[model samples]
Target chain A: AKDTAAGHVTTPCTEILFDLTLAKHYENQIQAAESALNRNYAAIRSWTLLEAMSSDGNRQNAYTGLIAYGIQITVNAEQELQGPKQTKLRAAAALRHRAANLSAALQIQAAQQATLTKPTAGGAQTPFSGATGTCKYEGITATAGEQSCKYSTEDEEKINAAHMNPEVMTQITTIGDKYLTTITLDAIAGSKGNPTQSSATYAEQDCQDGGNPGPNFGGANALGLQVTKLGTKATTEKTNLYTAGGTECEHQPGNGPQKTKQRLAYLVCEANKAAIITPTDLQTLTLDALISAPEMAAIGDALIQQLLKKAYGQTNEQFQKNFIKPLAAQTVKFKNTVAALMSSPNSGLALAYHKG
Target chain B: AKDTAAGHVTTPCTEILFDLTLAKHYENQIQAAESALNRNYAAIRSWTLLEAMSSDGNRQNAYTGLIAYGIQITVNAEQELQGPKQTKLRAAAALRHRAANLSAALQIQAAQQATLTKPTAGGAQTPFSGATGTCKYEGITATAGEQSCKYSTEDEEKINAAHMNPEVMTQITTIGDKYLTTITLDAIAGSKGNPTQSSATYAEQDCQDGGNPGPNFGGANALGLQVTKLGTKATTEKTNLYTAGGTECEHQPGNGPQKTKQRLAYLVCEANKAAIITPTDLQTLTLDALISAPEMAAIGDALIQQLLKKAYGQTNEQFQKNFIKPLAAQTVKFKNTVAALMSSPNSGLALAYHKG
Candidate 1:
């Protein structure tokens, strides 16, 4: 199975083995740690996976410790594998980071193919086929075709276009993978025992600095970075909309159902106007709206009945008991309350009968 | 000029005129009401159209009142235009509703088109072409093409296949409009006025039962209904993920930046696991994740600088201030917190430093 692209492989997964092993049961511990990193990475990188992580506190603590330990050993591995071998790996890492950032920026701008120049031993004009036309490394500019070098692009449209396209993204992915694999092979060829404390210390520091110092650090892909940005924006947007009029609007009348319903109404109105609402926000708002409108019991029931009966192959009476009955009661009560308020002798109270 | 399908015309719009008029200034009020309804409906309906509605409380009250008033007049119109005319209109309505429910059910079921038989003056054997086949009325029993009819399956799998494609969701919009137009035309031709009080009362009752009872009701299609269902499901899943551990986890740390950062990490991890994440969701999630990670400020700044230089043809210090500075500070703080925790005296506390 091809490991060039990010996906499943039928072949054996190449576990990244660190040189500095700890504990007598280090194999078992490392196995667990590796498994977890893979699982968490797979889970955390997606935007649609909705499954909640195991929230057991003990489990979380264990997992956290394992991960921390794994990171430490991984750094040790980098330390042990330093020199010309490490340099190539670092170059691969840098190229990957560059590719990710460029691609993300291009996507935001919605542009097409952009040129990336990789400086090398040959002519600077040496062109590669497809979207990533050429590249020029920033530091220690080397000959073309060498597996070690940095890449930088100055073209605005080219950068936007190149990174935005899936084809170009794949090219970038393949390029990084190839370089990393080459370094891995080189390191294996130059295998040595333990390194001196000073060299190891330097490697550890370099590893830490390159791994996770600030934003855009280490192996954190730009896509992940971009998603993190969007998620915050979503919450901020939600806060602004929810608190637009503060207590006067959101908490008026001190009735939970009505206020919540009013909030939904307000959000819908706001959502209708603003172009900035994220899908996650929209989902949240819709759920809140459905929760607010007790009067929508009939429609909700119909929808569930229809959806389940059609989608799930069959329906159960328990569904009605669990889902529909409670909502139905609330709807009836809300309707009755509205009716009573309309019939009240108090003009002020009657005037306040609002249909959200 | 056709009001059968949604959207607009270059020519004057054809308003659905009702026979029952209340106030002498009904035209002005109805015109105003119609305008508001159209404006609000248009605003609320589209997934693409982005505009904010007037936030003035008075305008909302007026808009709400106008919608209610419009519903009352619509019922009146239905009441006055009863008898044979109303029968045909009701039949058309029934057909439309049946078509809607059945198609939705079938779509959910992934069922291929079988057959339907349309009832006729002489018999129930008339056949219809394209996506919609023929259908027998709900309480009647008849042969495959008689008054109580049955439908056949033949039209190449074209309709079902064409619509099942993503591109077809938009086409489904046009198809529903066309079908509604045909039904509306059918209803208009069968229109008669000045009904008996008993029939008018019945018409009013039916209108109240099946017509507008809430915001954006009546003419709003089931497509909107399907969308709302999907939207609600989105939130339900999100809520489950966010509050799985209640205050024990999601809100435990009491550090807003870290908590927010963790949430982003969690979401990104979960997203990476799910295979069903859409490109749009990926984009949004990436953005949110980036926003959540305070360390992302530096990366974001670099990204903007690079992006604008390529795409916008320029960049400035203001861009950094407006976009990068705030996020940068938060990221820096969060990173420091993590670093400090890792260096702390307590092993347990130090081990608790998790990335996502």
Candidate 2:
């Protein structure tokens, strides 16, 4: 796998939110935390991905919904190598905070968005080629991939597009996998030593300056800040004829199910590829020793060890000991921070999870 | 405009949650709701209608970050249409609930999805034709429209396949339009007539059942219902992989920005269609009037009017009275009901908006 755009410094830091509906069985704080984090990585940085979700040809909700719900966290080792907390933790917390309070019946849905970044090319394996997916040429600005940077040549873009061909008939899976990465530090706080946890949590103290909204601040700027509170339910005071059911209204609009699924795909895909800061460093932590401590387990380190894996590199004893083990503990720390942030009374967010 | 499966449901209800983030400048709740609805709707539903904000593909943050808020509701309008709530009040309430909570951002995004529902002979728009806009065939489902309805004969299907003319697109659009009839009712509850609002509102009063983890009452009898407290902080989430002024971790997701515009199309397609339901008998009962006094609004009469129009034909006045006015009111009511249900915790036991 290539890691050229992995170092993209121009990556904009915009507020993103993951309004989700959790299953009652999975409504517990911990499960919700996991779900939110699972989808947090790429979700927090996904303005373009949002547009892509509604692609007509690629209606990818079945797959993308999974990503948005925070399930597909670590499938690629390359993304794993980028460090979990380094890029995903903060965003997940912010997202979870706003989603925790969603109604039980509405748990299957979520939305992720951010500030507008300069439009990029449709950097895919089929760079502007065939009807690989929806929005392939809808004129929406899409980003190039970390690997896409390597294929700067016109022919390379064509080859990359062809290479994106996978077993999945629809581009939804391809949309999420090819263009995105998700990192879940589902263990506990202090597990991997996630630094921004406490200070970053949207607690009373952390909310600095009328809440961190973004580029400026307010409801729109806070990175992954969730606005759980709907406008007052005034009888005569009508909200937009369109604003009913809040996020639920969002899940399936009149556009029909295809667009719904397609848009969802873009969300998951964008969330996966939001940012790349080298999670490889996460592997350096020790898990075996970390999990032994009951404090570490509360967050979710061991869970990460079991479900998470390295994407690009070969496994080594140290990979488990130095990387997986310790990183698992760190995953716990990040998870805790997420949990803590979600623990807020006003915060309607929480990670979503399920019994496998 | 045939109401068969001739149109597309651009954005599914699920997409609305994230799409609502576009209401950045509305000062009041009404304005927010209005702007979110109109702005988002205009962008996603009608680029031939209007331009969606944040079209640039680069800003993954804006795309991925917007997933943090709103409510999602699914009503069995079919059941309501055929059940005790035959007042169509329940149906309207369901759809209105969705409309009430639609985020502006989602409206814009979903509208874009409408563009994707290019009419196909065997699929979605089987009854409508005229490919004046950009034709997108990405997310077409084989199980949909006339495609599965079985042509007159193999020769017809083959001929239809061969012809593949704009008429195919028209037919698809017609099929899609029919599809919306269900969705419009399911998505938006009755804002017209004596709506089930009081019932829905009263039902929401019991919050303890918010987290009822039951079976899917519709599909597998799966049950897990969590009620979302409207305006409660307990119902939203925002993903935060990276924070602004924090680190590159919060950089926008890869495909985030582009997916933002699809939801608007979802709402518009549904709402616009819903706008047409008027009954001759209920011509005097405008949606606005109906909401003001459900007692005066003869929902049954309105439904009768609607059925009559289908059975006979509709005059301009009859159209407005029977289908248009009632549907418009019900549209708002339906959206509101869905929003409330989505806000309530255990409301998840409801079915996907179509069956009802």
Candidate 3:
């Protein structure tokens, strides 16, 4: 394609040609990446994700918080990225970062892909084939905020081992009271004849000796546990502990309600993780298997007002605003630059090779 | 997670579980392939291809024929593939074939990517630039249906050399007639005031003596040639030829009008190919660069009136009917099978991993 007639222009022509070629290649790669990002972003924003979370009562509040946070981040990110006059190189770099983040987000989508598979016809009743147990910790002093329970080691062992009715669980409150637990299964005490069961019981107590005043058995100041069977014995090999309510041991901070909520969320998260063997439903399976360990610890609202924060880490919102939105605006700038460079006429090369 | 509680159904459970796992893997691959196919297929069917072909007058007919052929093949392929009752294995194999075909089709899309770059503002006026030439063959019998033209060798050498008007062209028919012509370049014969030139005289002759009765000088029985400059002298090292008009000699059958059309199509296809050293427009560049040699040969239709054959070969219709349509229908069958297997209870694996 060289020409003696245009010999002087050859060097410039060749440079332009090379630039056009690179521009075209990058255009294609970026377009494909953009398409993929759009696909996954839409999926995350789909009604299905919200619907799935809403249907699961335990995680509904968490999902709501995630949505609120997700939208806020998206809008704010768009403003910051588009507000300033930015350099072309900066735009290109931002787009690269965005591409990486989108790729990571897509990995999360792998599990979400399963949500649309046919759901069980009716809501799952219960996975447990047989279960009926209720244990109550009675007469513990409320003043036991920092006092260790005086229950004997033998009593603790007996409490852990007990299962059905007839085998009762016994514990001594720090109030010097003898508490007799009727049920053994450590299972949720359901309505009588309901088969499903549930219960509220104290696992630990910090209190002083003597009178039964302001008992720490069941209140804002209580430490409790509950269990619900999620699958038949024929199917799963483990028990499901709902961890409906609980208090953190001596983790950090106060004995206030906020600390109590924090304790409950973490305990519930852990219990859900431990409950996995063969899950009876996809929701349970997702909660137990899909979430990673680090994600669990990162989902804290110090107030712990929201219960389902498993999917939304504190950084999720920040990433969306600062990275995702800015990336979109930056990518457009890069595309325009490439298009202009490829179309200029001083280059003997035709714009025919330009992707734009 | 096998269970004695459902012992009698254990065999079915195992079978279902196996099926579910297989279904899950296929679902992911197929969905990915499906997404890919859709993206590329849309790209192929974009307005650029249609617009590029529509803009060029010379290749317009060939492209129109190609479109007709393309659509017919696509529709027919759909029907045959879907008309049969296919097994799961058949469905899987069909999907694999579809994926491969789509991948191949996308490769064809690369050069096609060039067609939409900026075009010359007005219609392509002359197929060539800086050219003026005209040559006429004068000779004997008009009834020389199969009689060859008797143009002499000196005439061809003179004609080829007369690319610039200062050099005159002369030739003698086999019947001993003298002719003088002036043709500088074989550019398109433009409107008045433009010195654009044209002439398709004889490149070779096979007849001995010719009377007016069987004379093949300028009839359906004549063979001719014309010259066109493809690249500028500064760039290209040789003169380009257009082979504008005239006729094929006594090479084949009857010198009927049918033969003329066939010859013209091929010549035009060739001329377009030569016109591409530096095209005035992207449409011209695409027509010049995108078409392959065999394709140019394959597009002829005279007595060969199977007018619209493109890349699809003879069974294009059959292939479209038997493969494309059926493939679409068959893919759905595989999707449903995977869905059902993943959702069934007997499958101990949770549907949580199944892609919808």
Candidate 4:
């Protein structure tokens, strides 16, 4: 936001780019690539090429890395792009590499709760029938050296090592390096001359699949602007989430909820995408023109849309449904917090209510 | 907030109570407890009893579980007490059990980046010196039975098991069951008759030392209200973090920042706490009177403060410093996210800069 403010001495994309460098955790580095794409048009061109050229093996890590990077960048773009802050962006960049599997841990706890539901204290009293839950590392300590190392790597490594796995060095580095250098030169040179940003605005309707989500940035106001904005879908399916009413749109339905979820998920994808995008021209200018040329938007949006669809398409019903959370949902995306979790009722009432 | 609004059919404290049930997975269930304190006066009495009567054998798990519960509830109380959405409350219930040790993983990643910092086809022109990073399980699936079972248990187990870490059902059940039942009855029965809410407000000075944190809930607005509110301290240490200024206060210092950190840590303990306390009488009556008796507030606040001071006192310097992040800090508390990490500069420039 400050970038567009009535002032000078705007911060640069490169600084933001390096700020991301500090978040080298593997998932984070790929995140590095995503943010880099937004900051440097040259990097974007290389990403395009990576997708443009990949094999079955490389595709898994390569595409996975890029997609992971894309996912994080997209969220940051939505939540703070207009007024990108490095610290928040740093943490924003680490919003879980797009996902957790607490099912097993959760299941054991659930089964126990089920057992308690039938305690000797009575007939299925379930005074403590069950509890919904998950787990995590509080914070990695000094001993996690390799982990820290990951926090400080290059974009190419993010793609190759973290996303692709196999930390061992290899020949693909040559191809990757070659493509990256080429794009950097292209983007920088092109920006020095051509006017790539063809300006325009989508009808507000153009942004959503169906109805307006209202004046709200997807119900941000209702839940308080401080609500967590990453990964939570803001659809009405949850009854309370989608404040602006996009439920009338094509995607939402019990039988077709995934589509709606997918749609909403993608909606955020782009909202997130726009957050970090600094045009090649704006890339050097420091402020005011972060918009991608319309051409880039289409390409990036389609690329992300396709990938997210792939993720949601194959992701279980649960993951599909989480595309947006009611602004009211707790948005903590990592571990080690000073906040307390809600208290358990120690009863089956909520379990019976069976809502989120 | 509507929980207290006029012209409304009020939501029950019990219903809010059960909502915590869905967030088992150990750390969260303990979180379950903290919220229970604010709503049911009985739980507070029981919590008092537990503290009153506990040996070292039960203290570790008992205290740890209760404290975890306290930590989470404290955050919720601070962020959403005036008006918390249950969905938000539910997720808020699991803001990590107050920890993680990402150091090893982060370090290895860091080391690799440092290695990258020293490489190249020629000179030490490091394009990707390092990236700050971390890792996690995206979203647990249906496979981990033991893990999930933990998410669905009664309160006693939360203390005896998750906090203790064995998960095996044991003999302490006699004492645990006896204690929980007694408190529930005492709370419900008491609320039916006498008033437990003694109304009061602290002088603004009463709330802080040396200086005010502003009208801001510790700098919440400056970073945008949507900023993640949990675990983040609102202080000037980060240069961009504390908005209202508590830097003049007694606690903040480099050599003794931990004192300030601990002070800030405790400051949040109560802010978080008040978010949930419902007057037992008003709790039964359904509207506007959730303040804990001043007596209860003193007891609860002191208990939490002491415990927190202990945690922060013992926690490493790194953890202590993180009690507050800039409001600009992404407040993600777990894994698996769509938000991207920032981009790596892939250069030594950022590595050399080293400010964030």
Candidate 5:
């Protein structure tokens, strides 16, 4: 939030990019790429062309590294082109990377709890019968050295190869240096001609720098403010976590009772989720804009409708009747028995429920 | 708490017994027997005898079985004790057991955090550091259950049978049918017209044919009262968990600045002993009946003080400082302290802080 706020002071685009960054849950190092991209736009253009022209394998590798780098810059973009097109990209990536076996294990546990009942002292009981229990892992003492280095067989040799003392050489940032040189040349050259020294564009020279070289620059609350203003004009209003009826909307079942057990399970899930999420959860979703986007409304509505249909689908008898008659009815004449009110002009848009 | 309450409902001896039981922390059953013998009275015969008689083995085996059985019985008796006694016992026992460890852990964590300096952020011309983080482990799932099971094969095979079920047969009172018959005859015949019953003497007819038992042969609360009365008053009172300032009295140093970790652990053992104590804790030490008949405040005070001392002795510093010295001093000096104040008080009295 601080980083975003700071970006707004420099350019509108910086603030938007910061919002995108905050939405992705990358708390740290987001501002690095934002500064890098904004500072050396000319060099960034050349780097982009170089990456595009590379071989398929090299291009992919470049994209992998650049995309990670771009994600950081996207966080600083002043405007976002949000639609259904790339909205689910993060969620899909997370789902894919979470490993088949691990997800399978979680799913298997979920299925077991859903299907099986447990035996209690009195009689048959459910797996969820007992009080909430908590357990923790055995403790690991924090060691001073690199934690992963312990796996090496020879400690002295590994330390000599991998570890560095405080006085050792610092890591040099060649990419960062290249970007800085490009930005400085652009700033110096851009200022040489028509704009007077007192003009805001000319005055920007004092604000613009090759790096955070002074004490006052990039101080507290700068980046936080920049991110806040980028999406300021969009629908900033948040829907209440509780629905209109004052019920715990997040925990309440969407469907009325039919498949009682499954609905109850959904209620349990909702309750557990609600315990962690408070009334301001929808607003917090603003920070991590996963489910709060407008484009997701269609997909969310579809999911809810599917939940209801499965919860209260037609009986087997109705299904057979509908299937048998549909073929013959299509060829038959229309029985035009319109009621008095129904005979009015069909000029306005009409919405139907469960039409399909 | 319920168990201790129920025990008190049947007798007035509950609280005193509880106190003596809690006064010592026995690492093993043998130590428990020795401690029980050390705090002895004739009416309060060592229940350890039951344990010894139940098993036939070498002396060591008998001792082991006896202590285990004693611990089990103590656990059961805890459920039967009455209200005030139950509360005191529970508080005392909790002090002796798990409380100390838990309290210490919390305190250590608190102190560590308190000792940390405020955080520093990005330095001059430097990038933000990205790795200062922590994570928590949830429970272990069956990530690869069969593999885990296979790895645990030796430990499982050695302990599996015992963990699978409780050894119910070990709990049977009689060794065989012959012992069962003897036990039944002894209880029924010995109880008939026993001197402890009303009328002071057994009528031959009361035991002659062992005729059908009458409808209790007692009526009203007065008769019930006579049958139930211990014919002795209770003197010792429960330990006050807090000081005059309302801070917890039992402090465990490891539990942050306000340490009471020791107190809680001591309570655990205290609660265990309070479970199976007979009338042993009720007797007065002096020869004069008029001075301390019905109750002995000194004995009661001694029990609490000693128990607290034992909880602290060589194990907990707070216990040593607050309880051990004061209690041991009273025994040696016979000083007019809380120990002296308890004699024949007639009502529940409290031992205050500062030796008053």
Candidate 6:
């Protein structure tokens, strides 16, 4: 019901790598192109959601794409979205070239990593009392009641966080009956006073300088995971061990598993778990139950229809023709992307944190 | 210090796949041949251990090699050990073909899995009494002292169990002052009345015909891990999930993490842990300190010499001329392997279980 983990843009926005194992299966030049289409679709769909999230004060510009560890993931979504090449087969080819560039770099990145900053009193929850913390960053940033480095009050921060929750668009059931105006392009547009939507298509490609090694990228929190109580949760920001770090291994060491928590990192990761289509969102009575990733289905759109009718007095016809359908598609796209990205030898939430 | 978990001859002998991720990293023509060398080395080393293990009542011949789920890892080590193509580059090429046979099947085996039988009572500790159990195998499997399905009395089983422990040879540091004769290729040769060694090279190639998907292959107990108490350690055998099904995922439904123990599965897995080079062997005081997979160095030979000198009253000069060196090499070979095989995004003990 609450979306507090979604819109976090740390001072240093790093990047992460997409898994290539599945693509490695079923080899064939032409058929390779076949399996590749799946990856390309995933890449483009993920790029679009990431593009949309870029507006939420998340550091990296989603459009220009990330260039880090020598891997350049240029958003192939631009022409793939609506252009002539957007045809599945055509775009799949274009994106294959983009992914090819990633192959050599995965080796480089997997083995090498440098220190990234850890979190300090992080943001979370609706109507939840946010932690008090000093803002820390690489700038002369100043603000009223929000001074020092540059972080919003926990209350204000939650607003941005709520906007990023994926269940807002993807739950398969009556998750609909709530928050009607919350998703209207108009309301989300003024969200955080930032230009929302409109060009998630080009978001990743617009931001190209070497992206930081995403410290909070592929974590259990990426899918609204529960706390495992590892790492020390500190109030002060400091150096962390993993690249593309996430709550999954916030304090996890390459040497062995830890029993403590990285206080702030834990807090930040805790918030990350709430934004996705979580148990409560799916109406699961018990906690810790994972929603099997739904197929790209109409079930998702139907869920939206409930919210539209109940809150806006909208008709089924209006729902069918309105922007909601495209939004739902994007929701499935991102949810599946999260699923794909998070898929591992473990469970749904445990990440590939120890790639080395 | 104990080898209780090793040498388990489950009613059915299954098979498992090796990781190919490292081999896939670099792209090349001749250079690919270079990386293939590392894999070939690992294959030979790991194959040797599995072969050596076959003599201890484990089902399946080591030399035949496993053929399952369409993957045939026919040992290429035969000619490579001393034959003409034993040349590094040549065997590398040969194994590459062998590995290619695997690439296709890796996809197959990862997605497709069948249930395996769980472990019954196991042997452990120096004087510790072994558990009582029925053989429960696919044969009349008659035994003098053992009855029903056919199994060894707990104590007699411990003898074979002890022989399988890796620290029996490749430990680093002083470990010398203790248990010397215990390793004199001569003493070990009589172990469990099995022709212990002298041909580990051909052992794997000797065993073929679709080896059963090894149920107890890659569990946390593969190392000497104490109970985290994940699954019910049931005394009775039953169906289990996981391919190369080790303690790591014995009861681990690819579905989610469980909090109980697979009684027999847990016990069998626990036994598997002690059979390998363990902490007590390395003299680490507390338990659960995973031995860092040692490198192919003199350190392993040194560990063996200690056992040789102390137990057999053999001189260091006798060791140099004796068979001890080769055994240590095999020890390091397997230690690095368990380490390599165990390598993951988690720790030294976690297996690459959920490859799907």
Report clashes for each candidate as comma-separated counts: 67, 326, 41, 158, 70, 78
Candidate 6's DockQ is 0.01
Which regions of candidate 6 are displaced past 4 Å?
A1-356, B1-356
Residue A226 displacement in candidate 5 (angstroms) = 26
Q: Which ten residues in a row have the lowest lDDT in candidate 2 chain A?
A: A183-192
**Candidate 5 interface RMS:** 51.6
In candidate 2, what are the lDDT values of residues A5-106, reduced to their tens digit? 111111111001112211111123233443443334323112112223334322222112212112112223223433432323333322333222121111
Error of 3 at B236 (Å): 23
- Where in model 5 is the C-alpha error above 4 Å? A1-356, B1-80, B83-89, B92-258, B275-356
Docking quality category of candidate 6 according to DockQ thresholds: incorrect
How far off is each candidate at the interface, as Cα RMSD in Å? 42.2, 39.0, 57.2, 42.6, 51.6, 43.6
Candidate 5 per-residue C-alpha lDDT over B1-356 given as tens digits, one digit per residue, 9 for 90 to 100: 12232123111222222222332222233334333432331111121222112243333232222222222233223223333255444553432222222221121121111011111111121121111110111111111111111213433232222321111101100011111011000000011111111221112111111233332322110000000000011122232233455333333335554322244423432333343333222122222221222222222222133432332232444433432233224331121332222221200111111111
lDDT tens digits by residue: candidate 4, B106-186:
111111110001100111111101101001111111110111111223433333222321222111100111111110000
Better of 3 and 5 by lDDT: 3
- Name the lDDT value of residue A277 in candidate 1: 11
Query: Per-residue lDDT tens digits of candidate 1, residues B1-356?
Result: 21112121011111011001001122233334434433322221110000002254443332232222222233233223323232333322322333332222222112111111121111112121110111112111111111111222421122222222221111011121111111000000000111111111121111111222222212111000000000000000011222443222232234554322243323322321222211111101132332333332332332233422332123434433322232213222211332222222221122223222
lDDT (0-100) at residue A227 of candidate 4?
8
The TM-score obtained for chain B of candidate 4 when compared with the true chain B: 0.16
TM-score for model 3? 0.16
Maximum-TM-score candidate: 4
**Number of the top lDDT candidate:** 3
